[PDB]
Ligand binder design. Sequence first.
Ligand SMILES: O=C(Nc1ccc(N(Cc2ccsc2)C(=O)Cn2nnc3ccccc32)cc1)c1ccccc1
Ligand SMILES: O=C(Nc1ccc(N(Cc2ccsc2)C(=O)Cn2nnc3ccccc32)cc1)c1ccccc1
Lengths: 306, 306
Amino acid sequence: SGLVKMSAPSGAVENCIVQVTCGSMTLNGLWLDNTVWCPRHIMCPADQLTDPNYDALLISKTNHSFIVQKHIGAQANLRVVAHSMVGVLLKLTVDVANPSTPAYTFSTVKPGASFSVLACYNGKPTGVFTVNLRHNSTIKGSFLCGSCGSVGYTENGGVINFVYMHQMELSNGTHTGSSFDGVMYGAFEDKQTHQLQLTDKYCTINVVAWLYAAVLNGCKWFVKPTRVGIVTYNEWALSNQFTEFVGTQSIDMLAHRTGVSVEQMLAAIQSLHAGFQGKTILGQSTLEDEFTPDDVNMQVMGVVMQ
Amino acid sequence: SGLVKMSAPSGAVENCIVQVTCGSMTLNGLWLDNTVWCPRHIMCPADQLTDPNYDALLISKTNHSFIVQKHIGAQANLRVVAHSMVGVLLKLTVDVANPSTPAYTFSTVKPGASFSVLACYNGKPTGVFTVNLRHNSTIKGSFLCGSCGSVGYTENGGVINFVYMHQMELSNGTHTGSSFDGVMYGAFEDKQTHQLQLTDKYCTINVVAWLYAAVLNGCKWFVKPTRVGIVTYNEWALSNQFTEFVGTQSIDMLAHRTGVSVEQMLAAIQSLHAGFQGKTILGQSTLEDEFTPDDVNMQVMGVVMQ
Ligand SMILES: O=C(Nc1ccc(N(Cc2ccsc2)C(=O)Cn2nnc3ccccc32)cc1)c1ccccc1
Ligand SMILES: O=C(Nc1ccc(N(Cc2ccsc2)C(=O)Cn2nnc3ccccc32)cc1)c1ccccc1
């Protein structure tokens, strides 16, 4: 038992991290087969950060402009033989395939989805943590400018699913990046201008999963006979910065295991949002919305007890 | 900017995880050079878990009693050629040295220290997370029964420092294990009996470090001119389940960078302990005490807030 933020083991991703340098700027890249991916803003000189013309920047560079180095493991300097833009990514073709390329896929995750982040600095892995794609398609991470190129991923049956490359800090502790098709998560441009974020929202179904985790972990004081219909909850959610609830099979099975109904949990959310009354749930006095039902499922399998 | 629970990258440790089976019990082991470590309760029949005779169990086992397999990466079946007891651990000697043994050390951490955990199941790494050794030398982690043998570690300069091997769950969300000298953390025996947990406390210096991280991230509402001397706080701490504050250079450094004195932070603690007044710090409405000063140092290095 217990519930903690858990990341996928990072070894397979660590073997793919490299350092990329262009002019005075350096950050991290991801080396898969004969390709190195990094943010295109590596090309931008410090004085043009507000107004980058990436098309001009691209063609002002030669292949030799980009120095690519592998520092950890089987150390190497990698010759760049082509460079092109893929949305807000630079795609550097190099003359050697990464022999440690894992089986992999690319995906774009949806708000409410969790993934692991390998934080990197100067081409070396430095930390691992998990985030959730926020309703406004930001993430709440921990980064420096030198951490750009850090990689978000999930893992399933030996296959690494690459979903995020770190691009920018939008505001304090608020970050965004692109999927590997080069599309930036959310309504955000890779430039150094104030950009307004859409309002964030609690991910209801994640909150519900977390409350079920709590109940399986013996924490149940918040469960009452009180029920709220999904239609009534969703109307309330629109006025209180929660997402609308749509049930899933995974939630249904958690309800089955605990004997606590979805309508009870939605009622608990409404009460708890008004206040925790000096009490805690799984160590917290705020609603937790970054565990998905799948994340919870992985960490439970106890019999409901009490 | 941003502050998240960060773990050390796990790849170096992943290469050392194996599966160990004895009779019908299987769990995880750590393979370094020609040695495999695992909890000694792998020898115990299900029906003797209340009062195992580990010395008699050891004698009844042969080297052939133990099946060790590497299931990930370079797969292997490892032949056991010796077995001996090391406190609450078994030390198996195998006939093949792990070719991927990292530079490593062993140490035993003190209450208030953080370390990373690679959760494993049937000899396969499954997840990474960070814990803090509690005041009663338990940890608040996330483990299932097949997770025994999972490994706790830190990184120090390309050296893996192994500090924990998971042994048991004491109560919901409460765990302990041993260092690799085979000494169990805390007052706990490796038998299936209810054991008394000494009362936990808030680690004051960690809470202080967390408050400093908040200020460095532009969260400052809790800072007042109010001060409380160290000697006075410590008197207060004894009656309110906080550890005594002893100053360190790391904390002094944070105080200097933020211009907020330790005494102001201890005052904030006394106040926040009474209640957060409907406000939040770094997203939370409870005092966070599992970030060490060094954990915080590594995630800060932005420049001046007001
Ligand atoms: O510093 C340099 N470049 C740079 C690049 C990107 C950013 N932006 C905004 C942006 C995106 C596209 S254009 C501008 C971030 O959000 C970088 N970033 N990303 N995560 C960060 C966390 C903390 C601080 C900064 C962080 C800022 C600066 C530099 C250094 C030497 C030579 C040339 C350039
Ligand atoms: O299940 C078996 N053994 C076993 C071993 C240890 C434990 N204990 C307690 C303990 C310690 C020393 S002796 C007894 C835990 O705390 C295991 N543990 N460790 N972390 C856990 C999290 C959730 C549930 C259980 C967890 C429980 C059972 C088994 C299965 C087949 C054949 C023989 C034995």
